[PDB]
Design a protein around this ligand. Structure first.
Ligand SMILES: *[C@@H]1O[C@H](CO[C@H]2O[C@@H](C)[C@@H](O)[C@@H](O)[C@@H]2O)[C@@H](O[C@@H]2O[C@H](CO)[C@@H](O[C@@H]3O[C@H](CO[C@H]4O[C@H](CO)[C@@H](O)[C@H](O)[C@@H]4O[C@@H]4O[C@H](CO)[C@@H](O[C@@H]5O[C@H](CO)[C@H](O)[C@H](O)[C@H]5O)[C@H](O)[C@H]4NC(C)=O)[C@@H](O)[C@H](O[C@H]4O[C@H](CO)[C@@H](O)[C@H](O)[C@@H]4O[C@@H]4O[C@H](CO)[C@@H](O[C@@H]5O[C@H](CO)[C@H](O)[C@H](O)[C@H]5O)[C@H](O)[C@H]4NC(C)=O)[C@@H]3O)[C@H](O)[C@H]2NC(C)=O)[C@H](O)[C@H]1NC(C)=O
Ligand SMILES: *[C@@H]1O[C@H](CO[C@H]2O[C@@H](C)[C@@H](O)[C@@H](O)[C@@H]2O)[C@@H](O[C@@H]2O[C@H](CO)[C@@H](O[C@@H]3O[C@H](CO[C@H]4O[C@H](CO)[C@@H](O)[C@H](O)[C@@H]4O[C@@H]4O[C@H](CO)[C@@H](O[C@@H]5O[C@H](CO)[C@H](O)[C@H](O)[C@H]5O)[C@H](O)[C@H]4NC(C)=O)[C@@H](O)[C@H](O[C@H]4O[C@H](CO)[C@@H](O)[C@H](O)[C@@H]4O[C@@H]4O[C@H](CO)[C@@H](O)[C@H](O)[C@H]4NC(C)=O)[C@@H]3O)[C@H](O)[C@H]2NC(C)=O)[C@H](O)[C@H]1NC(C)=O
Lengths: 207, 208
């Protein structure tokens, strides 16, 4: 019967001592006939006992959805430990095991480049300030914009794209009124990633 | 029983009259017990009979895969016609139908901007040339880089991203030997989209 899907923590959660990163083991197609779901968890094959199973939930195709959440240590995740969720159930001929970790391999530091609007774009009422972030690994990253000790929120960031050397790049675009740019205001692209000192860097971009 | 997947044509194929846009209806998990598959195709709910359906082909997991390809008119696709593939097979309770069509909304012309390398990147052996393409709708688009009439190949383009105004943008990044940039070679970002004049525009980039 059942199917298991196992999900990683969010990039920022693994990078900030403040946040709590979780791995989540989701089970679907739990039948009303066989509702008792058991989870065992292992960190590098070592069984651990701190996961938290949430109460079951009725789905609308007559099956239950049962979730187990395991909180992980930042340094454990970042050092590449493997988290295995093993799901046991009367409906199965064998337990179902899923394993997840941070993407494997040597982390690489983002290079961050800010690019002013094109002269062609300066004919519009709003312009694009571009932040190119390239050469990073793994793809988990978070990008933001600020100006004058203030956060700018009118930006959108592409997903990471796999580049030809196996690292990733993305672009983040901040849209601003042209006049804010022409006055010489300074804007900055902020990036958080494993491979940066203090997990953090910024580059400025002004006229 | 069987499953059906219905795929659109490629955006450059719908935009250039020299290419042939096709909609592809694929059926998989066809059993030995019920091997016969029939396709009916509809365009805006009107049956058509001009599809090219291929003989079933047995897969290494001993199921059949059967494909039907309907060639579409370039202007039919861009005019938003709806293409429906209906698949009958004895193992099914009812035929399976899928429908596909261009995204709905008004078309918007892409704005294309080329941006040179950052000075900070001039310490590297390779440099990044950037093409920003923004303000476009629908998201179907094709982008490439050329120099001296020869197509570049060492570039990568982001997927289109929904912008705050409901249009899309993307960026394409071309990587080049820094010395080709230094020499003053000209590079061009070329863009094809339905809301451009003649479905095509090109913007050039070079040093100074
Ligand atoms: C019944 O019912 C149910 C339910 O229902 C529901 O639904 C809907 C529709 C409606 O109906 C309503 O009613 C409701 O709501 C069902 O269930 C279902 O199921 C299915 C299955 O079948 C599933 O699916 C899946 O999914 C996935 C995903 O999912 C996700 O997402 C979605 C959307 O998007 C959603 O929905 C969900 O929910 C999810 O979400 C998530 O969650 C999580 C958890 O919680 C989270 O996380 C978290 O968070 C938090 C906060 O919040 C924190 O942060 C923490 O830390 C964390 O953890 C998140 O966030 C979220 N997200 C979002 C976005 O939201 C997908 O994934 C999958 O897919 C897969 O599978 C399939 C098959 O099956 C396929 O097709 C696909 O493709 C895939 O596959 C895969 O692939 C991949 C690739 O890519 C792979 O890997 C790989 O490999 C390869 C080759 O080898 C390569 O190499 C690469 O590289 C690698 O990586 C893999 O392997 C594979 N896998 C497999 C298995 O195969 C699926 O799809 C769903 O989910 C469900 N739902 C739910 C809700 O759950 C059922 O089914 C029914 N029944 C019947 C009978 O029908
Ligand atoms: C037995 O073997 C079968 C054959 O498999 C072979 O391969 C081996 C590895 C091995 O398995 C062999 O035994 C065997 O030889 C196997 O068939 C497979 O079944 C799967 C289903 O179980 C199919 O999975 C789907 O794949 C879709 C994407 O398929 C494309 O991409 C993959 C590679 O990524 C490729 O392998 C496929 O061939 C297909 O390629 C596309 O092909 C089209 C058609 O030709 C091309 O378009 C044409 O291109 C030409 C020029 O080439 C021209 O331009 C034409 O104009 C143009 O139309 C594309 O270019 C080409 N693309 C690429 C990238 O190559 C998935 O999209 C699909 O996902 C959807 O459904 C899932 C449910 O199953 C769901 O989880 C998923 O989220 C998604 O759901 C959709 O979600 C969307 C979100 O918006 C919704 O919008 C949709 O509505 C929704 N869909 C639905 C149905 O609701 C799915 O994963 C797989 O294609 C198929 N393989 C083949 C080769 O057909 C079979 O399973 C085996 N059986 C058993 C029991 O093992």
């Amino acid at each position: 019967g059942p199917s298991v899907f196992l999900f990683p923590p969010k990039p920022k959660d693994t990078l900030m001592i403040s946040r709590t990163p979780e791995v989540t083991c989701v089970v679907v197609d739990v039948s009303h006939e066989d509702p008792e779901v058991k989870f065992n968890w292992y960190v590098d094959g070592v069984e651990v006992h701190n996961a938290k199973t949430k109460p079951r939930e009725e789905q609308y195709n007559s099956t239950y959805r049962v979730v187990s959440v395991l909180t992980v240590l930042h340094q454990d995740w970042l050092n590449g430990k493997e988290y295995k969720c093993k799901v046991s159930n009367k409906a199965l001929p064998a337990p179902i095991e899923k394993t997840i970790s941070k993407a494997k391999g040597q982390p690489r530091e983002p290079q961050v480049y800010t690019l002013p609007p094109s002269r062609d774009e300066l004919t519009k009422n709003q312009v694009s300030l571009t932040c190119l972030v390239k050469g990073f690994y793994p793809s988990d990253i978070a990008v933001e914009w600020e100006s004058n000790g203030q956060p700018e929120n009118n930006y959108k960031t592409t997903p990471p794209v796999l580049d030809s050397d196996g690292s990733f790049f993305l672009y983040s675009k901040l849209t601003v009124d042209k006049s804010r740019w022409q006055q010489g205001n300074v804007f900055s692209c902020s990036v958080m990633h494993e491979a940066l000192h203090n997990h953090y860097t910024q580059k400025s971009l002004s006229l």
